[PDB]
Amino acid sequence: VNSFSGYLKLTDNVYIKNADIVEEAKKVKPTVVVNAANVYLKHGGGVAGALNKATNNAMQVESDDYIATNGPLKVGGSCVLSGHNLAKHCLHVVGPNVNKGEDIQLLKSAYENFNQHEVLLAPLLSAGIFGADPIHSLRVCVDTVRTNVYLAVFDKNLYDKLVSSFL
Numbered sequence: 001v002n003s004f005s006g007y008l009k010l011t012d013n014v015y016i017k018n019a020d021i022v023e024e025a026k027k028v029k030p031t032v033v034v035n036a037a038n039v040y041l042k043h044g045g046g047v048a049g050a051l052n053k054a055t056n057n058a059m060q061v062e063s064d065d066y067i068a069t070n071g072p073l074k075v076g077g078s079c080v081l082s083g084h085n086l087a088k089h090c091l092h093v094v095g096p097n098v099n100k101g102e103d104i105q106l107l108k109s110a111y112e113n114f115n116q117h118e119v120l121l122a123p124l125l126s127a128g129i130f131g132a133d134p135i136h137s138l139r140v141c142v143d144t145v146r147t148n149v150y151l152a153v154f155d156k157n158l159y160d161k162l163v164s165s166f167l
């Protein structure tokens with residue numbers, strides 16, 4: 001049993017809810033919140049910009065130190081950093097950005113990072129301003145993630161479409 005409330009069960013291990021991941025994290029304080037990151041951990045917009053704002057820019061400060069030490073992530077890669085006031089940990093995962101020409105086959109590699117954590121709160125990778133089809137992102141998620149993933153979908157219209165089209 002966990003504290004996630006109001007989710008629709010899609011599969012054995014995947015759950016979905018129309019919710020702002022920021023407000024959901026502040027309420028649940030999960031062990032792991034997933035950020036829709038880029039390789040430079042520049043959290044300007046989309047989910048990343050929103051999560052960072054909720055930490056009062058502490059996420060960005062920590063991220064800049066991480067990059068100064070380690071260099072950029074790989075597309076499809078991830079790193080674990082602090083969850084600040086939102087979660088114990090933040091798993092920064094780089095889905096491919098279609099508006100940059102990045103290979104969509106890397107979306108599966110991106111979701112594989114979730115399997116290193118028993119339970120996570122997460123957005124659909126490469127959705128929103130990353131330019132991929134959210135229906136496809138949900139499908140890759142279901143077919144790749146084996147640990148327990150709670151998806152927060154901000155847009156109500158999109159959430160309804162994702163549920164009604166789910167096979």
Ligand SMILES: Cc1[nH]c2ncnc(NC[C@H]3NC(=O)CC3(C)C)c2c1C
Pocket residue numbers: 019020021022046047050123124127128129134152153154155158
């Ligand atoms: C403030 C905020 N909270 C979120 N919580 C979950 N997902 C988010 N966006 C990623 C993709 N999922 C969507 O519904 C829209 C999308 C960009 C296609 C967000 C955002 C921008």
Ligand SMILES: [Cl-]
Pocket residue numbers: 036045046047048127128129130
């Ligand atoms: Cl986003």
